[PDB]
Design a protein around this ligand. Structure first.
Ligand SMILES: O=C(OCc1ccc(Cl)cc1)c1[nH]c(=O)[nH]c(=O)c1F
Length: 133
């Protein structure tokens, strides 16, 4: 039952500071513009120890599957090749991506009826709020 409150289909309802977060990460202009316009759904499922997180939008469809604590290589929507590790820390999914000596952290948590995504690169945070679809 690990992650039960995360499982389901979620739709983006608000975003703050996402352009600035993408600039900090190194995302180029055209990708920032099209990615920032996207209204993704996030589809989270669990089968045994394997968690799958899909993102679907008009920009990109992505999918990761992973086991908590077990590093994996990920191609991000902006085409970075990163090494990722996702853990559960006090009920928060904490996703760390490493590439080219840089690091960013994406936290996903349940708050009331929302799934809140916080993306942090150095001092820049973006907050993205999802509701059940
Ligand atoms: O920032 C996240 O990915 C990093 C990223 C951000 C922008 C680009 Cl172009 C590529 C990758 C992320 N992950 C999620 O699961 N939901 C979100 O809303 C979300 F923004």
């Amino acid at each position: 039952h690990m992650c039960d409150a995360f499982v389901g289909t979620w739709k983006l309802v608000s975003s703050e500071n996402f352009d600035d977060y993408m600039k900090e990460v190194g995302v180029g202009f055209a990708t920032r513009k099209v990615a920032g316009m996207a209204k993704p759904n996030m589809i989270i499922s669990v089968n045994g120890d394997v968690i799958t997180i899909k993102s679907e939008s008009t920009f990109k469809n992505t999918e990761i599957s992973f086991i908590l604590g077990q590093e994996f290589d990920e191609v991000t929507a902006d085409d970075r090749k990163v090494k990722s590790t996702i853990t559960l820390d006090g009920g928060v999914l904490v996703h760390v991506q490493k590439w080219d000596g840089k690091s960013t952290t994406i936290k996903r948590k349940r708050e009331d009826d929302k799934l809140v995504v916080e993306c942090v690169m150095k001092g820049v945070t973006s907050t993205r709020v999802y509701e059940r679809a």
